[PDB]
Design a protein around this ligand. Structure first.
Ligand SMILES: Cc1cn([C@H]2C[C@H](OP(=O)(O)O)[C@@H](COP(=O)(O)O)O2)c(=O)[nH]c1=O
Ligand SMILES: [Ca+2]
Length: 132
């Protein structure tokens, strides 16, 4: 895998955002996690996950996207990637806080699964947020 540059256009919610990628606006959806819904057609911690993500990416110097080794988009046309804000993976950061659960694990796009699962285990052992 490798990291590629992108530019933040707009934070959407905990696990989805608009980025400029190779000169084109796209929706990206984080691999391997699910944050609570803000706009369910509010779930608890939805607002908190959205705010955490928005702050992390809006404050960043540099945003990067890292595709996994399979599909790079979902059926909605969303980019599927690990997003990094100044070198810190946002997907992992949310899970470490108990603001996302590890979810949507679709092979072959599961390279960081164990990593995320170990963060989730710690967040649950610390009883944070979703696990409180
Ligand atoms: C994270 C992820 C979601 N999805 C699909 C599964 C879910 O489909 P359905 O909409 O049919 O349930 C939806 C969840 O995204 P959201 O969590 O943004 O709604 O996106 C993928 O296909 N690949 C992925 O890697
Ligand atoms: Ca979600």
């Amino acid at each position: 895998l490798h990291k590629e540059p992108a530019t933040l256009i707009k934070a959407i919610d905990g696990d989805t955002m608009k980025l400029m990628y190779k000169g084109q606006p796209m929706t990206f959806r984080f691999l391997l996690v699910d944050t609570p819904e803000t706009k369910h057609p509010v779930e608890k911690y939805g607002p908190e996950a959205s705010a955490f993500t928005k702050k992390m990416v809006e404050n960043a110097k540099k945003i990067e996207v890292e595709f996994d080794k399979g599909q790079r988009t979902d059926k909605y046309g969303r980019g599927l990637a690990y997003i990094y804000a100044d070198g810190k993976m946002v997907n992992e950061a949310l899970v470490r806080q108990g603001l996302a659960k590890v979810a949507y694990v679709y092979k072959p796009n599961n390279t960081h699964e164990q990593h995320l699962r170990k963060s989730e285990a710690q967040a649950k052992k610390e009883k944070l947020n979703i696990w409180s």
